[PDB]
């Protein structure tokens, strides 16, 4: 095969949409093998630049194809330096930038810890005719700055595997495996605005609906539940734009959904409160034992939720 | 007709948008047909990437365009590989990405079970100039993965059939009839985050709606039924971006619906209680019976429409 | 002149947007002419593809220019096959997408009765150098099925007009006049999700506003006045992204305002029932018979309103 | 120089955002100049349709480039013909779209009064190398007719102007001034769906809380005054998406802010009604008497601020 | 290295994106160095437009290409103008539009003071094959005009530095450092809206919810705090689309935060003073004190939160 180095240069990293859990990579991307010697004016490089790279295309040089492959829609080229140095090698320097997207667990919203993929792969020459040797990454634009609410830690790590198409089976027999690089950076989400956003908020609106029962009568207990029902609907649409759907449970809806409980708990409980009254003679306080015991319970919940 | 054989791998499928009624696919497609043979440089088969593929439309190579007929705009291609190998058989190898959309029904809103349909026909010749031999399509990447709320099973159908295009009888006096491949991926949607976001926080202010017939007044519970009132009208906004206008109704909605008509019988039937009072010294405890009735008569409905 | 006929095909209606009143419509257009008898490689008709048709218009073939008058942006064409026949006829088949955009009234909003306009016009020559002899419209897919919201009705409408544009008079004396084609398709809006969404639960609220004078005190009522016009204010809400800004008042925004004047009335009502006391000995019942009039007028004011 | 005449027809005027102070036009531009004679295939004028126009640009034709100064983005070019007439005259007939951006005033909302402005200007040649001679502006399609919420009235006046640019004069030492043709379409706002939408409910809302001084104790006209103040709130959202931001006010942030002065002024003399009582036996009617002074001098403050 | 000077022209800064933390730039770059003496159609300067110039490029002209370094996407480019002299000097004159990125702190939300940089850098040149002169900005369009809501103050400062990017370090031994042009715009946010939308009507909630403890009982001064938590709420949403999400707290926020502190402060201490009646005897008044403290504690903490 033909040997080809890569050197990824990272921009910057913006745009992290974790609705549509993609994200948007900027920066340059250089390739480089080793060809026949050539003749070029002059001891200096050759420079080629772009709509005028087709020319020495159509007149008979070897140039592949680099595409993403966890890109979302075509990636927005701009420039391309086509450089030739008269001992032989041709470099291939192009600036990419494109949607790309991943896995992107949410198993904790708020202190969630992720991780940026940017997956190389020719598009056309399988692994016995191009050959990825080693790719390194200058990362040092955003080696430890704030993006968004995103703070990178680390450096970004590197790999070279082959990864095999079985679709492209039908027409080669057995030489149809592709060479990957795959570039991880990884990236830990800030928590302090969801901290005190939502979590510091929903808990207080916790204590308020615990503040039901040390009321003296029914109506006025029922409005105060009703009142904070309304107020837990209104913090049940401000998560609706700040994830998408999940299959399962985050921190913040375990806590919309333990809001609802205890609320409509509360209810229930001040219900049977005033149906425990047979002849209307007996008094409601003995159930209502649940002021210092239904924070403690709800704690232990929470707690258990914890961990 | 000269016989073609696609191959369709499908990378993503990505951005399911339950509104627009669209949804938006990645992917490769491999078609192959044979023609005359020909001379390559060596025993290797050719390869001619993308944008110099023209110099060999132009030099004379007879290749057919492949367009999706479902789709929604221009499909957002990339690369395409045409290889060549010398005994006659020619490879089109191209990159697809589109939006694509489909009927879509919506009987049950949270527990759907749809289809996401691929439909592929030539633009240009009618199937005796031709006629597509057989698809394989391998969904190896998403055949038991899991795409945002929507659990993909199964493998993915493949079909042939021919169908016929009345607005070219016009220039074509009998042969006019277009090859088909549809291409069918059975998607079941995941009921999770409604079962805990809509259905039971709707079915609990139900039951609060319930309960406000165990007051002792007039001007208290229609308060308290007014508040109830209120927060419907708050989940009757929350479904208005989670489903496109339909023309029946879903579970959501037929769930609204009864959460009004449950709240507005509640104050018909205590303005009526209220107005059986002909000189002010009945009681009316009567007609409020439904503490133990009224429940039962609105599982009975639920019941009824469940099935 | 040189005579062509067109055969529009229509493959589906889509994304109809009442708000910026457009919609899209994707399918294909068929221009057909005859020209001066021409050689082809044998018999069978000769078939041109796309991205290879501009040697054939640099070679000096005469092929007309059709735009669409009434788009929205730019039309979204893919395809495009110049087929030739040997006897003389040269024939464009295109394939079309865009926004086109219509004047669509809105006098009655749920009861809405629209139509779809598709109009073509050459962009060079006048009729005196590309006359439209005849269009034969083809809506075989979408002749009685639903699309979104509207249920589309009976066949789309042909007509041949000559339209005249005096911005091209300044350049040409008297041959400075257009050949139009315009395409009709009648569109019925469907009106059952406006029924069960909008009109119904605000007839509801409104006899929770007729039910505010059956109270017997002052504040009680006031307050159940208020709450109601929180409500009314919650539903004015949800029709700012059901239509556009509009001149005149639709169904559901005179329901609105009707709402807002019965609120408001009631509201006025009870505070110079208030005020009639002038030394607070006086009762307060006399005024208070509208409890079986006022709907009544407000009925009345609605049948009138409905005609 | 050579002198060159525009006649620019406007189609449509459409997608008037007020928000981002930009609006879309569609129409046609035609060009025209005159040079040397030339000869043409027959006596009837030559045309070059689009995408072989560069042929002639190619082969030696003069043709100018005419670009909009004030549009955001590319302007969205379609069909383009050059004519030629063998007199000597040669026409450049393009459609043009895009987004223009004006100053565009708010300093009254509803009432608005504003102008659209088309700047046309060549990209190269100065006025000693290229001067507009006249423009006629064929607003014949809109002339008289409303689009969206706006009234057009009037002709589309017409200018032809001289302007500088300076940062030319590094590389040209006298002659650096280009020629600018502005076309001026005056706008008037139709005010009547902001009448019954917002100005009109917001003076309900006004002598609703005008209606609180009418009670006899605290707490229920404090509650009052809490819910109106709610309902103020909501309408405050209202106007969020109906105006960008303004370094001033308009009529209805006005209205809003005086609701809000009105509401915390009744609260502050409810307050100090109560904190009057310096041992609990005084009554609280004599600073009450605000029941027909308060909407005197708030019907004053809209005077003034009317003019 | 080949000296090259630049004038960037302005024409007007739009669309400021302060939840993207993007701006978009409208004007003109000219680019300008000296090249070998050239034959020119007579004495005048030669003109290349657009999509011409690549028959220069193709015919050996040395052109370099301009990239900006902070764009988001590729710069929208229209016209480009290739003007030569016959003396030597080579003269690029192109349009650029695009939106470009900054850090654009959030320390003080309503008072920001912000700028807008340019960074203009060469694609494949390094500084001893390109050295950037100087640059002479023309910001004479906006140089005290008032964009949306932003004062632009002062002029725009100028800079020229050389970056090093170490990326291309594996194929440059040692000369692989750019030319760097940055250009800085001072921007002032101008901060009355602000200050009438949210920092007043939020400090006057501030003092409603201060005036609950001027009640006498119980359940009426817990409704009235429960009712100004809802209104709190409301505040919460309408600055979710005014800042993108930060790590840090402003103003706004802070203000929200303590809002929420003081009104379930106040709850607290309500439920305090209730529950300090061991027996049933006690009075409530002495916990009661804060009237006259609670604003003075608030103000103090307002007052450091200030500097
Ligand atoms: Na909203
Ligand atoms: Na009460």
Not at 46 to 60: D, M
């Amino acid at each position: 095969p033909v040997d080809v180095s890569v050197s990824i240069f990272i921009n910057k990293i913006y745009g992290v949409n974790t609705l549509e859990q993609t994200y948007k990579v900027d920066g340059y991307i250089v390739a480089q093998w080793t060809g026949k010697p050539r003749k070029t004016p002059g001891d200096k490089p050759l420079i080629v630049e772009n709509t005028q790279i087709e020319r020495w295309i159509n007149n008979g040089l070897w140039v592949p194809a680099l595409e993403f492959i966890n890109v979302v829609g075509s990636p927005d080229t701009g420039n391309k330096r086509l450089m030739l140095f008269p001992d032989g090698r041709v470099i291939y320097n192009a600036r990419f930038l494109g949607s790309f997207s991943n896995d992107m667990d949410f198993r904790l919203f708020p202190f969630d810890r992720q991780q940026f993929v940017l997956e190389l792969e020719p598009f056309s020459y399988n692994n016995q005719q191009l050959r990825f040797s080693d790719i390194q990454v200058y990362t040092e634009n955003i080696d430890n700055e704030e993006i968004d609410e995103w703070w990178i830690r680390g450096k970004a790590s590197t790999h070279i595997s082959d990864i095999r198409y079985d679709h492209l089976s039908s027409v080669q027999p057995n030489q149809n495996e592709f060479s990957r690089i795959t570039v991880r950076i990884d990236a830990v989400r800030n928590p302090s605005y969801y901290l005190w956003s939502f979590i510091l908020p929903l808990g207080l609106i916790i204590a308020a609906s615990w503040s039901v029962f040390w009321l003296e009568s029914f109506s006025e207990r029922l409005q105060t539940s009703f009142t904070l029902m309304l107020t837990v609907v209104a913090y049940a649409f401000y998560t609706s734009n700040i994830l998408p759907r999940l299959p399962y449970t985050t921190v913040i809806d375990q806590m919309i959904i333990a809001g609802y409980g205890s609320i409509f708990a509360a209810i229930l409980l001040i219900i049977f409160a005033h149906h425990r009254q047979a002849n209307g003679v007996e008094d409601d306080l003995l159930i209502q034992r649940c002021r210092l015991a239904f924070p403690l319970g709800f704690l232990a919940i929470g707690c258990v939720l914890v961990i």
